[PDB]
Design a protein around this ligand. Structure first.
Ligand SMILES: CCNC(=O)[C@@H]1C[C@H](NC(=O)[C@H](Cc2cn(CCNC(=O)c3ccc(S[C@@H]4O[C@H](CO)[C@H](O)[C@H](O)[C@H]4O)cc3)nn2)NC)CN1
Ligand code: CA
Ligand code: CA
Ligand code: CA
Ligand code: CA
Lengths: 121, 121, 121, 121
C-alpha cells in the first residue's frame, strides 16, 4: 500500500511505490484542497465549471486528480477508485498527477493526500 | 459491499446494508456534487469557506458527507475512508448523511454516490 | 485476525478473539501434529482409519480440528477454510476444538497452530 | 485466484495461474489424501515418520505439498500459508508439487485440493 501527497504544481507527477500488475484490483482514496491558479481551491474532482483549455486528461475536470499506469494514457482518479481493475490490460508503475494544461503548472497551489492499496483477488 | 446515492435534501440520510461490527475495517469512496442552498455545488468535502451555523457534524464542513454507525454521533466521511477502524464501542448500521443545519435542508440539491466495503481484518 | 495454539487435551477448546458476524467471510489455516491417545500423531484432518466411537463432530475424523461459532454445534475445520461463509443463523465467538470423544481427552497430546482472519466482503 | 488439484504422481508439478509479484500477500489452503506408494494415505503435511531418501524438499516430510515461485527452490506449503509474503527477489508463477524422491513418482496416488488467493496489500 502507498500513502503520500501529490502537489498541484508538480507537472511531472508523483511516482508511487505501486506497480499495477495483471489481475490486480486496487482501491484509491484521495482528499485535500488544490488550485490551478485561482485563490479558491477545489477537491480531487476539480472544478466542474471550468472549461477544458488543453488539459492533460480530457475526461476529468481542471484540478482533478488523474494518473498514468506504466505507458498508459491519463486515467481519471478524482476522489478515488473502489475495487477497480485497469481496462485494456494496462500495467506498470502508477504516477499520480494534477490535471492542468501543460506549461501552466507554475501558479498551482495545494496538494491532495492519497492512499492506494491492493485488494483481494 | 454497498453502492448507492445520498441526497442532499434528506435530513434522515440514507441507510445502507453495511453493519459495522467491532474490529471491522472498512473503506468508503464518495463522489458527486451537491449544494446546501447556493447555486454553486461542492464535492463531498463540502465548502471550506462556509461558517458552521449549527451543523449536524461540527468536525466537517457544511455540504460534506458524514455518517452514523448505529446510534453514534456523526463521524466525518468526506471523500472517503481508507481501511478505517472505528473508535471503540460503535456498532450498527451505517447511515450516510449530508452535513447541513437541521430544518434547513429544503433548499438543498444534488447527491453523492458512495461505495462501502469491508476490508480484510 | 487471530493466531494461537489449540491443545489436543483441551476438552473446552480454545476460544479465539474472532467473533463471527452475519455476512462475514473468513479464512483459517491450521497446521501441526497431535494424537487422541496412540503414540503416533496426525495432522488437522485427523486419522482417516479410525472409527467414530462418539466424537464431538461426526462429520470429521477423530483427531481433526473442528469449531463452534457461538453456541452452534460443531463444524469441521480440518486443514482450514478458504474465503468461507457460515450457515445462516450461526454467529458469535469462534472456539477451536480437537475432535475426540467426550471424557477421553486426558490421554491426548500435541496441538495445532491456527491462523484465522476476516476477508473482504 | 486459482482452485484445482495437485496429483501425487505428477513429478513436474502443477503450474497455476498465480503470478507472485513483488509485494504480493497470498493465502493457500490445501486438503485431501495422497500417497508416495503405500496403500495408506497422508494429508498435505505428509508422513512424519518417513525418512528423507532424496526428497525434492528437505524442509518438508515425504508426501507433503510444496511449491516453487518462478525458478526458485522448493518452499514448503504443507496445509497452507496464511497472508504470506515471499523472500526478496522471489517472483513468478506458482507451481505446486507433491514432495517425493525424484524418479519415484510413478507409484504415487491421490491428490490434494488447493485454493490460492491474493490478499490485500
Ligand atoms: C507393510 C508396512 N507398512 C508400513 O509400514 C506403512 C508405511 C508407514 N510406516 C511407518 O509409519 C512405520 C515407521 C517407519 C520406519 N521407516 C523406515 C523403514 N521404512 C522405509 O525405509 C521405507 C522406505 C520407502 C517406503 S515406500 C517408497 O518411498 C520412497 C520415498 O522414500 C518412494 O516414494 C517410493 O516410490 C516408495 O515405494 C516405505 C518404507 N519409515 N517409516 N513403520 C511401521 C505406515 N504404513
Ligand atoms: Ca495553472
Ligand atoms: Ca440548506
Ligand atoms: Ca483420547
Ligand atoms: Ca513414490
Amino acid at each position: 500500500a502507498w500513502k503520500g501527497e501529490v502537489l498541484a504544481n508538480n507537472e511531472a507527477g508523483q511516482v508511487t511505490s505501486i506497480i499495477y500488475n495483471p489481475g490486480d484490483v486496487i482501491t484509491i482514496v484521495a482528499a485535500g484542497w488544490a488550485s490551478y491558479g485561482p485563490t479558491q481551491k477545489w477537491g480531487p474532482q476539480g472544478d466542474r465549471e471550468h472549461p477544458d483549455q488543453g488539459l492533460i486528461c480530457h475526461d476529468a475536470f481542471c484540478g482533478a486528480l488523474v494518473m498514468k499506469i506504466g505507458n498508459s494514457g491519463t486515467i481519471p482518479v478524482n476522489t478515488g477508485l473502489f475495487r477497480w481493475v485497469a481496462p485494456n490490460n494496462v500495467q506498470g508503475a502508477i504516477t499520480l498527477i494534477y490535471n492542468d494544461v501543460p506549461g501552466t503548472y507554475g501558479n498551482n497551489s495545494g496538494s491532495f493526500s492519497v492512499n492506494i492499496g491492493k485488494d483481494q483477488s
